[PDB]
């Protein structure tokens, strides 16, 4: 993956990041979809990634994982559909704040992986989606590491896993 995630010769960095970000959104959207039946208001009253990491709605104001993830994923899809942020027409340049928006998108998608690994790994294994989860996460992480798109603090919840995959 180290090579596949590298910027192709002559390829535009923003376009490269844009195309891959869409792919990552689709993969995590698919993976979370497989376990939504098990991520409920009762199972996850607060958005967390294990006993050591929790994600507040505002800060503190907390909310369930399903509500948190649905809002986060809806927001990402809206950004992908924003022609001013992710131009699809030829000649239209990416906005000046594109890199910043892309990093925010990736930092947020990471939290979905974190939640699934920490709170629903049992369902992943039962659905035999373990290999799929690991493969998509590895691609995601290798890409972010290649361009240093996610700060070290954000990655804390899956640091142990990150090292093993490396």
């Amino acid at each position: 993956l180290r090579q596949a995630v590298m910027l192709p010769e002559g390829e535009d960095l923003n376009e490269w990041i844009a195309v891959n970000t869409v792919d990552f959104f689709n993969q995590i959207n698919m993976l979370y979809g497989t376990i939504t039946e098990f991520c409920t208001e009762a199972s996850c009253p607060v958005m967390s990634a294990g006993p050591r990491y929790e994600y507040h709605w505002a800060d503190p104001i907390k909310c369930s994982a399903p509500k948190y993830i649905d809002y986060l994923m809806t927001w990402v899809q809206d950004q992908l559909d924003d022609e001013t942020l992710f131009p699809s027409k030829i000649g239209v340049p990416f906005p000046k704040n594109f890199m910043s928006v892309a990093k925010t998108i990736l930092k947020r998608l990471f939290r979905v992986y974190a939640h699934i690994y920490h709170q629903h790994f049992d369902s992943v294994m039962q659905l035999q989606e373990e290999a799929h989860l690991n493969t998509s996460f590895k691609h995601f992480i290798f890409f972010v590491q290649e361009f240093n798109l996610i700060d070290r603090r954000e990655l804390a919840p899956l640091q142990e896993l990150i090292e093993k995959l490396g």
Partner: peptide, 15 residues
């Protein structure tokens, strides 16, 4: 704690 947390865990990947 989850299985992937074990130090002996070898991340299974798609083939």
């Amino acid at each position: 704690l989850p299985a992937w947390a074990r130090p002996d865990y070898n991340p299974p990947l798609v083939e």
